[PDB]
Design a protein around this nucleic acid. Structure first.
Ligand SMILES: [Zn+2]
Ligand SMILES: [Zn+2]
Lengths: 115, 114
DNA sequence: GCTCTACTCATCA
DNA sequence: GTGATGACGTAGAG
């Protein structure tokens, strides 16, 4: 019977992380390691990792979970990504965590300059 | 015996202008009146009339004729619009021809002031 | 801490 | 005189 990849103890995996994100990770371990397993909105992915719509809209590149938009079901559905996937992608895109920092620096100098 | 709306004489209408653009206009009169009847590419519509992709892509709004892209059939199809439709939309959007020149004006000042 | 689309230009197609 | 899409962004309206 397969064990959770963090704790190596649990055999009941988080249904979302397992079914949607293909991760053999229990619910308690997901909460204990948000740096790998937290679900991020589309908007959070753009803000946090500077990924673009084309990257995030690409069905081949990321797993994702859709939910009704929490402001209204008539609005476009919310889209949730798993941190470890979007982070891996962004580290490749920008040159590691330091890469991302660099890009953080640059955009804020812009917004400073633009005032 | 239905007649061209420009010349009131010809009965044989330009097949593109009639079939595609719903205009009861002969080929000769289409050539004699490019201010109404010329076909303009999607690119020319953006450059000439400051129409945007959303406007030009809206199938409800304009009639259009597609053709293979002249640079290569593997590229996106060429899209042709008729002047009188594009222009009327643009005049509506920008406030007349003067409106359009004002916007022409505004944009060149950008390229200068950049 | 919601998301899509719309508002100059290059490039590749 | 070819066209779609993607970029330093950001506000609306959904
Ligand atoms: Zn576990
Ligand atoms: Zn005629």
């Amino acid at each position: 019977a397969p064990k959770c990849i963090e704790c190596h103890i649990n055999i009941e995996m988080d249904p979302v992380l397992h079914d949607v994100f293909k991760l053999q990770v229990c619910k308690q371990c997901s909460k204990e390691h948000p740096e790998k397993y937290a679900l991020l909105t589309k908007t959070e992915c753009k803000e946090d990792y500077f990924l673009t719509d084309p990257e995030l809209n690409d069905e081949d590149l990321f797993h994702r979970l859709e939910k009704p938009n929490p402001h209204s079901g008539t609005f476009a559905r919310m889209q949730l990504f798993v941190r470890c996937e979007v982070e891996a992608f962004a580290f490749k895109k920008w040159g590691g965590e330091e890469g991302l920092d660099e890009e953080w620096q640059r955009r804020e100098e812009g917004k400073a300059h633009r005032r």
